[PDB]
Design a protein around this ligand. Structure first.
Ligand SMILES: [Fe+3]
Ligand SMILES: [Fe+3]
Ligand SMILES: [Fe+3]
Ligand SMILES: [Fe+3]
Ligand SMILES: [Fe+3]
Ligand SMILES: [Fe+3]
Ligand SMILES: [Fe+3]
Ligand SMILES: [Fe+3]
Ligand SMILES: [Fe+3]
Lengths: 172, 172, 172, 172
């Protein structure tokens, strides 16, 4: 037992480890999506910067959970990081949509995790989730919903002009 | 009676009080429109900022009349600020059309306030309107006209691409 | 149903919309209170500047709730903004006492909007309330508590001298 | 007849010349009032600085009318500047009440000089009055109204303490 540990239940330790892997997973989805738009037959340079920025942000989230695990006396346990479901992401509107489906599963995971932290009476783990992850997911999800909408209204994906002008008037 | 009152007819005092409610009403409409474009199925961020600017200007027109009422020795008498007509504004073109209708209705009320003040041989009240309101209405009305014309000519509302480009390139 | 809505109960949607009305009503009371100390027969410049600031900060309180509704996928429905209880607030001490009542009123709504968010297991909404409204009302209520206490111990409202000196020294 | 005179009635010529006298008389009252608070047995430094400013701004009010007469082709005819009603204005509150009377007096003349310019269809003279004298008197009369109200609610003139504190805090 760790000398710094206090009020940190074993089940939150495991649920922090699991959230670490999901956050790494998401960073790797975003990496995958980013270099898809770097492709010379997709070629939406700001879609690329976007998802690459998100990718780095998501690994930033994973490192913040690993720091916390150590602050609370928990022990990190890492697992394989599954390859993304896709190798090709089809179009910009399509890519925005999987990102939105992705942040809503990261969100469901945090929400279930905050729920556990409430049952196990850990207010420090609860504020940690609240400050650094909860509004962040709410913002992310609102952002991606805005993008999907403008893309649909412009004419994407059957219009390449739509994804071209969006690629630069919104993500530039 | 007020120690400062002078050539300030009670009809004026009442019409100023009504004008204050009209400006507050307008401000409330513009607030409702502003946040209609904030929402995730609309996502026209500069329409939302345009109208939030108009909401704050109208609120500031109201407060100016309240200063004047107290300036001339009248007494402020606030009414309920009634709920705007629409909760959903359909589109950017349509929001712009309602805004035109509104500033033109505010102008007509503002013009009636002026006919009154002439009838009452109140010259200070006349110059107050001339300086701080009449040209404002003429300018506001002209601007929304321009905006209507351009939106129709770009193919709105049936073009989703028109409102989006109009958002980037006229309101940003 | 909205593409960003996740874990955002119908009940909470309605409660926010209501808190929006309330924050708008409070901005109006303060507006009404503000221009009463501008009267030539009351003449408290700093009391007036005080409530105009409070009024404007209550408007921002409402716009922030309007933003949140759209972030969470909820749907703004506005309401008549009913006129404030008074058109004549008697004295600076009476006016401050009304605000103390008014702010404890809004505290009430928020605490119940929070219990409701506890009931519906919405931690994001909860910390949103925790971070942006709760300590503000605790501060706002303590600020007015101090003001009311000072005016009483000075001789207000019988001493008009008390209110003149408060106006320059605590609000200048 | 003057080479620049155009649409400038004999009647208006005479009315301006009269308003010139009046503005000069008001500068003299204020002058007289000013050096009464300099007395070693009254001793209100800021009351004194107050009326000396008002006196000087009334002189500029007269010189501006002198300028206008020559712009319009009219012909200045000056008059005795009669001595002010008092040589002893009793107290700061009484002095402020006299100014409120005096400024409502000049408001009177201007409003009638304006009706006259309406009667003679002289829009230039009208807007000249609108722009440079009307809102100044509305401001001047509201300023003194506030001052009178504050001194009364403080205890003036019975409390010499009231007038000492007004002198530093509203006029310093
Ligand atoms: Fe992200
Ligand atoms: Fe994340
Ligand atoms: Fe307006
Ligand atoms: Fe406007
Ligand atoms: Fe407040
Ligand atoms: Fe509030
Ligand atoms: Fe003092
Ligand atoms: Fe003056
Ligand atoms: Fe003058």
């Amino acid at each position: 037992t760790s000398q710094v540990r206090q009020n940190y239940h074993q089940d939150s330790e495991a649920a922090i480890n699991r959230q670490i892997n999901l956050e790494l997973y998401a960073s790797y989805v975003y990496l995958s999506m980013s270099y898809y738009f770097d492709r010379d037959d997709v070629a939406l340079k700001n879609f690329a910067k976007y998802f690459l920025h998100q990718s780095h942000e998501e690994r930033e989230h994973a490192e913040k959970l690993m720091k916390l695990q150590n602050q609370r006396g928990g022990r990190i346990f890492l697992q394989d990081i599954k390859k993304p479901d896709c190798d090709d992401w089809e179009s910009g509107l399509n890519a925005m949509e999987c990102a939105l489906h992705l942040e809503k599963n990261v969100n469901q995971s945090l929400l279930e995790l905050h729920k556990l932290a409430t049952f196990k009476n850990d207010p420090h783990l609860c504020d940690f989730i609240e400050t650094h992850y909860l509004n962040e997911q709410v913002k992310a999800i609102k952002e991606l919903g805005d993008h999907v909408t403008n893309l649909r209204k412009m004419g994407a994906p059957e219009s390449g002009l739509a994804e071209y002008l969006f690629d630069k008037h919104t993500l530039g």
